[PDB]
């Protein structure tokens, strides 16, 4: 596996260590996302971590189906935009 | 210290500008940067598509170049696609 | 008081939201939603290509719907085909 | 003509204001660029047209194949970004005194 892969390998395994401890093993609901987001993105997301409304605000934009469950599909959006925000902040 | 997720989001830039750096303006891949980087980091079944199908859908303006935001839509793709391989 | 061009880009969310808001998640525009915001918004030439095509084009992360920034795809494609048509 | 496509029209007709002025009559140079970004664009840009260097900045990050000047396909990638950071800005919302 290259660099690559196993970076989206890290990925698909974070989600799913959050995924599967409650309803769906495939999707995060509102509680899981918020401890991922806590732990897992606690410097990227340190300002936002503060302010539950800002990490359901969040939420609420990448659950493009409005079931109030994040499946992987919806989650890799916020993957990639945090990807461009760090770039922007190392330059 | 970062977290193992936001270092594994890093890494995807240092993903980018390995192709990126080669020449021109090192925040653009070009055709051949692209091909060089799906050969090497992307598996089998993102490889077969092609690397000139896959420029033609990541250069989202036609200029020739695939830019960072544009390399992060072969990335949103190679999770999604993954993720079902995982799954299955 | 803006200028014409910065009135033109909000103008664009403004046509986004006119499609967003009909149902569902306001940052989503499903499969018909698009097919309607071709229809009204788009000229022939990017009609022609289907909106279904469009759609599979357009929606980078497979979750059924187009956000925002995928409809901002098309907006980039719109421009350059128009610029190209209008500067041949 | 519908409304999105009276908004990319008024895109390209603002690019050709500039383009035309100086060297190849449909692409911008840094001279043109500039004084595009310091008249249309002087609120959304307010904060960069203050350092011309950063302005200079956006211009290499947009001409992707290094000759100096901004076709429109280089262009319209900036147009976008500035209709995205419009929309976020609009979403936080604003500030108001002694
Ligand atoms: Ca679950
Ligand atoms: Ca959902
Ligand atoms: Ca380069
Ligand atoms: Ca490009
Ligand atoms: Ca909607
Ligand atoms: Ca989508
Ligand atoms: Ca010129
Ligand atoms: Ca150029
Ligand atoms: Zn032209």
Sequence with gaps: ?????????????????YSVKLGHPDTLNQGEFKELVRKDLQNFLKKENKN?????????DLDTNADKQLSFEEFIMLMARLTWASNEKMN | ?????????????????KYSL???????????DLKKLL???????????????????????????????????????????????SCE
Excluded: C
């Excluded at chain 2, 210290?1 to 500008?17: F, G, P, Q």
């Excluded at chain 2, 080669?22 to 051949?32: L, M, P």
């Design chain 2, 22 to 32: 080669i020449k021109g303006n090192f925040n653009a891949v070009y055709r051949d």
């Design chain 2, 1 to 17: 210290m970062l977290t193992e997720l936001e270092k594994a989001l890093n890494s995807i830039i240092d993903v980018y500008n």
């Design chain 1, 52 to 60: 539950e409304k800002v990490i359901e605000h969040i939420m609420e």
């Design chain 1, 1 to 17: 596996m290259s660099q690559l892969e196993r970076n989206i390998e890290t990925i698909i395994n974070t989600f799913h260590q």
């Design chain 2, 39 to 85: 050969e090497t980091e992307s598996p089998q079944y993102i490889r077969k598509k092609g690397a000139d199908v896959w420029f033609k859908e990541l250069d989202i303006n036609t200029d020739g170049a695939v830019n960072f935001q544009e390399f992060l839509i072969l990335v949103i793709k190679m999770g999604v696609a993954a993720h079902k391989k």
